[PDB]
């Protein structure tokens, strides 16, 4: 059963489509005859269009609003099989050339949607008296249903396909379903077919790049949620469409929004934040520099030689994580924040400066810089830092611009508890408080590998000893809410799926 979502393109991409999971956009010869069931609408915009096999419209999309059967400006258009349009209203309007259709009623073809049912130009249905309306109501809808109410795996009519995951009371956990079937269109498929990727709702779709990410956790690609920003490689300054650009300019700042892995080199120079003339680019606003905050790796060099003064840190690049120097500015410098007015270097995440040597120089007000142990951050043995000519180290100490003692001696890229390479105590997320909430604390977390792990929110805090040993509700020691078998739970399972999707009462 072929599927579809310029006239020749449509007549070639819809001719053999037995069922279209998109919509029936027949607008403006006899290329379609076997369109059995449609999980959507039908954009009929023209006088002889057979449409014999058109049976069910699900109305998942609408032309304007609940507009499934939109017509305009077709006597020999025998949609005889179209007996029940589901989840939509018939906009059977503008029928100037339509014949024998006014004789047939247009209401039995729709269910509980006569409210938005506008139609204008026992009884025969289509062209020719050989066709009839074939009343069957005045869960089958097309007359072991021929067309199912929601889903028809092979022949049965089902509201929902067998879930890919079925709770396992034997394992006392919500496990997978061995007979799990992804709901491909209106049919349950054991394997996600048609090179379709498993989706969040389980309905495999061939495109799940919106607020998600593609992954392969099994032999079938799975659409996973976009962890923060999803990976979206964009070429930088020097490579790609901006290969001849000289800086991250205002005309070029926008294309870098949500750009994860800048594959060239970000090289914000004085010209950009100054604005360039002979390059025909107006001045870049300091606020728009926040667009680059999604950057997570710069497979190149960052030579940030001017940043806005009212920002006391290089906060706009506060998410750089790998600055691997595939290309090197001046061949030796990879990160080269030089001659700025930044207070604290602020690059709180940069934990792999692979190739170049790092020169954080001239920044006459960057004080927390010198203390960092640049040996681990450097990734290649030919890296030798050049932290020079900053504000006075003795001046730094006397002024008190020293790392907050809630930080390990590894050095700290900012005065705040967030910007510290390692923590003297354990760490709670980005920053590192003096102590985790082992006994006293709101989140009631548990330290792990010198890192705070917030306990299961379904687990009550305990006042005598530590609250929850490890992540996951099973590892929590106290659970004020109900506990399901050997694991704590939000609630006991009642509407669960069993051997035959049985609603397991479980316990009381």
């Amino acid at each position: 059963k072929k599927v579809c979502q310029h006239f020749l393109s449509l007549q070639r991409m819809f001719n053999n489509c037995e069922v279209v999971l998109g919509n029936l956009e027949i607008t403006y010869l006899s290329f379609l005859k076997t369109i059995q069931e449609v999980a959507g609408y039908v954009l009929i915009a023209l006088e002889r269009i057979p449409l014999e096999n058109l049976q069910i419209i699900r109305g998942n999309m609408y032309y304007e609003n609940s507009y499934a059967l939109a017509v305009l400006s077709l006597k020999e258009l025998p949609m005889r099989n179209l007996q029940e349009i589901l989840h939509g209203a018939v906009r059977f309007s503008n029928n100037p050339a339509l014949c024998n259709v006014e004789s047939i009623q247009w209401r039995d073809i729709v269910s509980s949607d006569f409210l938005s049912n506008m139609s204008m130009d026992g009884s025969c249905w289509g062209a020719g008296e050989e066709n009839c309306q074939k009343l069957t109501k005045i869960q089958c809808a097309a007359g072991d249903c021929l067309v199912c109410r929601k889903f028809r795996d092979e022949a049965t009519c089902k509201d929902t396909c067998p879930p890919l995951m079925l709770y396992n009371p034997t394992t006392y956990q919500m496990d997978v379903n061995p007979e799990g079937k992804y709901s491909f269109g209106a049919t349950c498929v054991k394997k996600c077919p048609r090179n379709y990727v498993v989706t969040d709702h389980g309905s495999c779709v061939r495109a799940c790049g919106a607020d998600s990410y593609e992954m392969e956790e099994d032999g079938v690609r799975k659409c996973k949620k976009c962890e923060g920003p999803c990976r979206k490689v964009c070429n930088g300054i020097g490579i790609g469409e901006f290969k001849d650009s000289l800086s991250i300019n205002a005309t070029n700042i926008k294309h870098f929004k949500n750009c994860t892995s800048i594959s060239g080199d970000l090289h914000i120079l004085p010209v950009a934040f100054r604005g360039d003339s002979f390059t025909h680019t107006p001045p870049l606003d300091p606020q728009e520099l926040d667009i680059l905050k999604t950057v997570k790796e710069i497979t190149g060099f960052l030579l940030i030689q001017a940043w806005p003064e009212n920002r006391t840190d290089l906060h706009a690049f506060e998410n750089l994580e790998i600055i691997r120097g595939r290309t090197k500015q001046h061949g030796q410098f990879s990160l080269a924040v030089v001659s700025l007015n930044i207070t604290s270097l602020g690059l709180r995440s940069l934990k792999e400066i692979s190739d170049g040597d790092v020169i954080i120089s001239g920044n006459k007000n960057l004080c927390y810089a010198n203390t960092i142990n640049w040996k681990k951050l450097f990734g290649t043995s030919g890296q030798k830092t050049k932290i020079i000519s900053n504000r006075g180290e003795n001046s730094c100490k006397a002024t008190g611009q020293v790392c907050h003692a809630l930080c390990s001696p590894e050095g700290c890229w900012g005065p705040e508890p967030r910007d510290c390479v390692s923590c003297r105590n354990v760490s709670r997320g980005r920053e590192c408080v003096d102590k985790c909430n082992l006994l006293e604390g709101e989140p009631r977390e548990f330290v792990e590998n010198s890192e705070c792990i917030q306990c299961h929110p379904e687990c009550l805090p305990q006042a005598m000893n530590i609250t929850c040993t490890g992540r996951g509700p099973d590892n929590c020691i106290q659970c004020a809410h109900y506990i399901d078998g050997p694991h704590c739970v939000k609630t006991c399972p009642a509407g669960v799926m069993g051997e035959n999707n049985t609603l397991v009462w479980k316990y009381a």
Partner: single-chain antibody
Amino acid sequence: GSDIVMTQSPLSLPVTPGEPASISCRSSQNIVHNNGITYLEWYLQKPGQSPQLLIYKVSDRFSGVPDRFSGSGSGTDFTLKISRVEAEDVGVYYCFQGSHIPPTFGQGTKVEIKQVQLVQSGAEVKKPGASVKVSCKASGYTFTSYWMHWVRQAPGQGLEWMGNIWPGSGGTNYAEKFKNRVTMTRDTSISTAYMELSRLRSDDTAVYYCARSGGPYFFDYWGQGTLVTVSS
């Protein structure tokens, strides 16, 4: 489009002091870039001095450029007005057109009567076919932070941009009129730029003034410029 003939309506129009002078220039194409900023300017060139910029955008004024001079225009029509004209106002007003990829100064109306300093090199005279290396020493600004465009003012002709070089990255953008004769080099160590024009011809003799194209204005602060006459 690159040759946006910026015809100036008057030519060598003389004006007595204290009069509402108005000099209008028309652009061969519409002077409107994709960025929408009418990169238009009307630079004054005092006699025997580097040209200076007066209207940094379509009607603004540069710092130190008095409010006495003003301008207006739209599309392909633009005009520069001197409500009050003084001895300072004397000179030739050449209008740059920054929308077209090759910057193009206009013919020019010479109005008559009815820190950071870029040091240029010294005057040299060569014979036809030879090469001249015009030098421009830079001080007062970060050398590797501002494009150094090099405009050439032919005797008996208007100014024409010739090519730029970003002092850091050595990248050159040479213009068409010398696309196969000129080479611009940089010495970041010495904060100086050289621009060797080889194969000197008779009609190439001009003072290759060395400018620094600014942020929102082109050709902001210009150098002394080294005259180079060539004839056999």
